[PDB]
Amino acid sequence: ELHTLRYIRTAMTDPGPGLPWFVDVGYVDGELFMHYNSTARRAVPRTEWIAANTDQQYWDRETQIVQGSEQINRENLDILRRRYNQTGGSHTVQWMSGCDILEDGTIRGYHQAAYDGRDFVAFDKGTMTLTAAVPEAVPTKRKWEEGGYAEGLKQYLEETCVEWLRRYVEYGKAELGRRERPEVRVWGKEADGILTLSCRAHGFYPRPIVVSWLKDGAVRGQDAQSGGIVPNGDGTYHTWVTIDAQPGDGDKYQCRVEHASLPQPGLYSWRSGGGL
Amino acid sequence: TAGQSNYDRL
Amino acid sequence: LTPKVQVYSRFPASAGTKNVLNCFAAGFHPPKISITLMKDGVPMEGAQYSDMSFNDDWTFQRLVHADFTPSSGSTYACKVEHETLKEPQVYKWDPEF
């Protein structure tokens, strides 16, 4: 029942070649649905469930507010460079806003910024004030206390996004709820008297997966090294786990893959061999 | 849905 | 911040069949990164950039994917150029690993 919404923004000085300087990306449970760039200057859908449940009037209203966000982040790069006293080079302005609907039903809304990959300003709901993490983020707090954006932002993070996220979950209930089975392949490589056994899971959904190596039926979590849950170009995910072994012990090892698509954890060997 | 452009001002 | 790169394929590698070569880099800063997929040292055709996001810890991430057909004798790799690496980091793609 844990459903998330996140709108990530990036304003750049050096994109660099061909790439756009401004980019706004939206997410529903970690999946891309909203796309924007400074070259095209249009908020367009990415998933089939969002486009089939929204009109062009919604996307036209979403474009103009992000176009305004583009211009606001354009001057932000120039304003922040004066406070730090910098001529130019590699400078970036990051922003991540959204709300989380927890299992119990508690609303967890976040709104925070960063300059040069370091925490700048973060909004708190319990205090209803914008917290400044860096001494150069103090004039930002002065602008927020004068304007009074605090009440308007709180009614957005607790109501506006929360009401829309409930609809987004219902719009893509068939897409998010769908489970994709992974294609498992068990490999091995010989180097300096050490056999490195590899296990790769191809195109699985959702993102959570536990891929562990086994020796004689017993799990060996410490000896196994994972590469992480890396994403594919179509929306699916990939994972790579390797373990060191004695040459001639390869078949004693088994790859355990426990995913939402599998009712029981899948056990795959090199000679079996793998998923096929 | 994203709110007002003013919340991104620094 | 130095990038954490991993080279992998979409579908399990099979000779004379169409596949997608993925190169994902994460945990880096500044966001400017030169990720190039190459066949025998020569850059690959149809390299598409789709990912331009950052994690909860503000660290950037990028995925570069291109349509290809795996052939025996041809070595596939991913060249990553960053201002924190000094020398370009190249990661080899193995079809049977």
Numbering used by the authors:
A (entry chain A): 1 to 276
B (entry chain C): 1 to 10
C (entry chain B): 2 to 98
List sentences quoted exactly from the publication behind this structure.
Crystal structures, based on heavy chain and β2-microglobulin (β2m) expressed in bacteria and refolded with synthetic peptides, showed that BF2*2101 remodels the binding site to accommodate two peptides with completely different sequences, including the anchor residues. Small residues bordering the groove lead to a large cavity in the middle of the groove, within which Asp24 and Arg9 can move, creating different configurations, as illustrated for the 11mer peptide GHAEEYGAETL and the 10mer peptide REVDEQLLSV. In BF2*2101, small residues like Gly68(human position 69), Ser69(70), Ser97(99), and Gly152(155) create a big cavity in the centre of the binding groove, allowing Asp24 and Arg9 to move. However, the two structures with the 10mers TAGQEDYDRL and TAGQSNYDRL display a completely different mode of binding, for which the P2 Ala does not interact with the MHC molecule at all (and therefore is not an anchor residue), with Arg9 interacting as a bridge between Asp24 and Pc-2 Asp. A further mode of binding is shown by the 10mer YELDEKFDRL, for which both anchor residues at positions P2 and Pc-2 are acidic. In this structure, the P2 Glu interacts with both Asp24 and Arg9, and Pc-2 Asp interacts with Arg9. These various modes of binding are presumably just a few out of many and illustrate the promiscuous binding of BF2*2101, unlike anything seen for mammalian class I molecules. In this article, we confirm and extend the finding that BF2*2101 binds 10mer and 11mer peptides with three anchor positions, with many different amino acids with different chemical characteristics, mostly charged and polar at positions P2 and Pc-2 (and hydrophobic at Pc), which is unlike any mammalian molecule described thus far. The structural analysis of BF2*2101 showed that this low expressing class I molecule achieves promiscuous binding by remodelling the peptide binding site in a way never described for a mammalian class I molecule.
